[PDB]
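User: Can you fold this complex?
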Amino acid sequence: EVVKFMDVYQRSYCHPIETLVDIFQEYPDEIEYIFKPSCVPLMRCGGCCNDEGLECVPTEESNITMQIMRIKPHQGQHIGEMSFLQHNKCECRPK
Amino acid sequence: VVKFMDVYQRSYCHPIETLVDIFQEYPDEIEYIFKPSCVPLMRCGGCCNDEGLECVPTEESNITMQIMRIKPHQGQHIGEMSFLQHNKCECRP
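Assistant: Here's the predicted assembly.
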């Protein structure tokens, strides 16, 4: 049941991974609202470069659109379209 | 367009594949460099839709992986290292 070295080595290297991201951190100026769900699943660059001079970053991105409920306390709740950026490709490059 | 009941279902508290730094999980091991420096592990992630609660593990289990440890100017060796995985999660107070 032991994960072999080259398999961990290849699986953890910098690449797009489904990451749950808070909606409010992605749309900072919407402070009068609560969102449901409060976070969404998005492909984002992750992992290690295995070299302290490099860092994992997006090289290609694209939008995804989802129906999110927007709540304004004491004055209305509406399900609408919200768009987030996803990372289609990543690379390790200098810092 | 992702439909509302589909995002609402998939973003809720649950175990997700997460890339974790090894020295963060082994703080006492300051004399080594690890390769790879991070590992893929199932860990609780997502939102609770309740400001009162938090997504936490209710069931854990170990996973063993071959990791290289490097001790600068002395040696290097690929050996087994164990990490904790999350099998089940819940939103709690």
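Strands of chain B lie at 14-21, 33-35, 38-45, 54-71, 75-92. Chain B has one domain: 1-93.
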